[PDB]
């Protein structure tokens, strides 16, 4: 029958953190009835579409928004702000998405893997699997350069680490 339809490029990340492309109406029942989301973090600065907003009104799912340029640069302070949102267990289950779930989403998640102390080899390889065919050197460069001292200091204080599978 194939009535369940996750958004393109959807996947679990860790714990109750998810990633995907921009959800469409036919994805709503999966996000709500199966993932049972509490929040969504959108990574593009544009206005959330009305149909998606209506979905949020109907379900009670809260929207967070950290608008990263869709040019390019992703400043460190936007990554830290996004991490504080998604790592807060009070915001989960949470879905992270941008337009296609490849670049801006991939950059943020790579920073999550860095907090999990993954090797850069496997972080970039996971990024490229989701980003194919448009893997960007810059997204990986941002991951490699991101100074995670602050968010780790914030995270340890709350006892969010280690992230739980």
Binding residue positions for 1D-myo-inositol hexakisphosphate: 73-74, 77
DSSP-derived secondary structure letter, 94: E
Closest to 38 measured CA to CA, from 101, 96, 105, 95: 95
With tokens 């989701």, the residue in question is 130
111 catalytic, yes or no? Answer: no
**Strand, coil or helix: what is 63?**
strand
> Which is catalytic among the residues 98, 123, 131, 151?
98
Q: How many CB atoms are located within 10 Å of the residue 154 CB?
A: 16
Measured between alpha carbons, how far is 164 from 143 in angstroms, rounded to an integer?
A: 21
- Find out whether 90 and 64 touch, Cβ atoms under 8 Å: no
Q: Which H helix or E strand runs over 139?
A: helix 137-145
Measured between alpha carbons, how far is 141 from 34 in angstroms, rounded to an integer?
A: 35
DSSP-derived secondary structure letter, 49: P
User: Could you give the residue numbers annotated as active site?
Assistant: 98
């Amino acid at each position: 029958s194939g009535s369940v339809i996750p958004p393109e490029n959807f996947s679990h990340v860790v714990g109750e953190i998810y990633r995907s492309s921009f959800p469409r109406q036919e994805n709503f029942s999966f996000l709500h009835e199966r993932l049972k989301l509490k929040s969504i973090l959108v990574l593009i600065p544009e206005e959330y579409p009305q149909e998606n907003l209506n979905f949020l009104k109907l379900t009670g799912i809260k929207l967070y928004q950290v608008g990263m340029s869709g040019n390019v640069n992703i400043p460190s302070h936007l990554l830290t702000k996004a991490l504080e949102i998604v790592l807060n267990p009070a915001n989960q289950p949470i879905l992270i998405h941008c337009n296609r779930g490849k670049h801006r989403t991939g950059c943020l998640i790579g920073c999550i893997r860095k907090l999990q102390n993954w090797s850069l080899t496997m972080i970039f390889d996971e990024y490229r699997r989701f980003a194919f065919p448009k893997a960007r050197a810059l997204d990986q460069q941002f991951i490699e350069m991101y100074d995670d001292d602050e968010i780790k200091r914030i995270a340890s204080k709350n006892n969010w680490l280690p992230l739980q599978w």
